[PDB]
Amino acid sequence: SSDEEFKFLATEAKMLITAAERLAGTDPELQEMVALIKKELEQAERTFRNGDKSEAQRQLEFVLTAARAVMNVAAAANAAGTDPELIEMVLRILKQLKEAIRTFQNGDQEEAETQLRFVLRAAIAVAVVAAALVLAGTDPELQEMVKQILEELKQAIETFARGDKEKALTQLLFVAWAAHAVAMIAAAANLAGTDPRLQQQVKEILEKLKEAIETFQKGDEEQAFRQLAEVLAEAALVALRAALTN
Amino acid sequence: SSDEEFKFLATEAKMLITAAERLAGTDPELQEMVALIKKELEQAERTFRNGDKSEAQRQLEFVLTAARAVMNVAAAANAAGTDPELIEMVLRILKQLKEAIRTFQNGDQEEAETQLRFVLRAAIAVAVVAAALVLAGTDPELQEMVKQILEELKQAIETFARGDKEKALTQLLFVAWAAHAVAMIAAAANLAGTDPRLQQQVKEILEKLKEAIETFQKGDEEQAFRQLAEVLAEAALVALRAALT
């Protein structure tokens, strides 16, 4: 569609791969996925130099989203440490990413792009959840919430594999925001320290997040999504307040 | 065009509007921009009920990108405080978002969508730098680095305004990853605390990022982008190490 956009896409794609290669470390599964996506990047470059440029761009745009996914998965695998629940989720997201790449190579591009839209959001959510658990430290209330978000992401991935992609997409949207909220609450509690004023505001916002999850599980989706958007804003503000004290 | 996709985009777009309203506070310029995007959202919902559902989704997909940009701008202005450099970039990005919305309303949808590609990424960048400045505290090296990122972002906005959209997008891409790098390094410096061994690693990684920016300013973009990509991974790894102590 444009030579200028191709070079721009190729530059960021190599950047995601370079970071993914480093974050993958010694894990053979992460290294295999990065090399697989890297070979798809170089295949799109040969097609741009030789054959169809508009087709090479569509392959590059797919490669870009796969590179960002594998980089978040690799970052999630590092922060996950030895937690089996997080490690298990990294494996499920990796397998679905590999299947989507095969589906794109096979020619079913619409299905593969539909799959990666779900895979990319799940990869970012598990990275944010993994960082939240690390930031939570030894706080039991924070670890319980992070574990509660993890199982919700597990149900969304399983619902997607069952066939109901629409319901799984709605659940993954809720999981993605609840993950971003708990990561800021955990960062707030870390930055608060021994300050009793900020540590009290963290518990209150943490209670509002649990209520938003309970609203989603009950059935009121419209009210649950509104409650979560409010919790995320408050979590960012309390994290800003705590960081200003340091 | 799909009904389930439209309902999905509308739910997410309302989430961004809701969060942007709280982050904007009493800012009259921010709340006005949120209200304009919110009215475009409701306009897309009315078209979905009474007219072309395919055109309503195309409008809603533009609204979603605009709503995510105004949320990051509100978060940036909230975290920026009275910082004049960050304030200056906030209204410049806010101004560009306004023109792109009026462009979409005039019928030129392709030019408006190309504008939001620059505006959204710039809005996320200025929000990350603003969070990096707060995490920096009084650290002069982290403050100087944050200012260096903001200068590159200023050049990218001005180059985009002067016509060369290609060069501006390349610099804005560098600005975005460098912004994410300084935020993780500043978070690592905060999480390290009084650990001299960890602060040396944070200090050295900050220097590797400074060298990456100098390679970009020298003209060698290819090597500068690889260096920035390597620094970003190292910044994420040192913040994890600092958090585990």
Numbering used by the authors:
A (entry chain A): -1 to 244
B (entry chain B): -1 to 243
Publication passage describing the model:
To investigate the photophysics of special pairs independently of the complexities of native photosynthetic proteins, and as a first step toward creating synthetic photosystems for new energy conversion technologies, we designed C2-symmetric proteins that hold two chlorophyll molecules in closely juxtaposed arrangements. For Chl dimer protein scaffolds, we chose hyperstable C2-symmetric repeat protein dimers containing symmetric pockets with tunable sizes and geometries. In this dimeric repeat protein architecture, the hydrophobic core is independent of the small molecule-binding site, enabling full customization for binding with little impact on the overall protein structure. We describe de novo-designed proteins that hold Chl dimers in precisely defined, closely juxtaposed geometries.
SP2 was intended to assemble a ZnPPaM dimer with a conformation substantially different from that of native special pairs to investigate the effect of dimer geometry. The SP2 crystal structure was solved in both the apo state and the ZnPPaM-bound state to 2.4 and 2.5 Å resolution, respectively. The apo- and holo-state amino acid backbones both agree with the SP2 design model to within 1.4 Å r.m.s.d. Compared with the apo-state crystal structure, the SP2 binding cavity widens by ~1.6 Å in the presence of ZnPPaM; this expansion provides the extra volume needed for the ZnPPaM molecules to adopt their unexpected conformation.
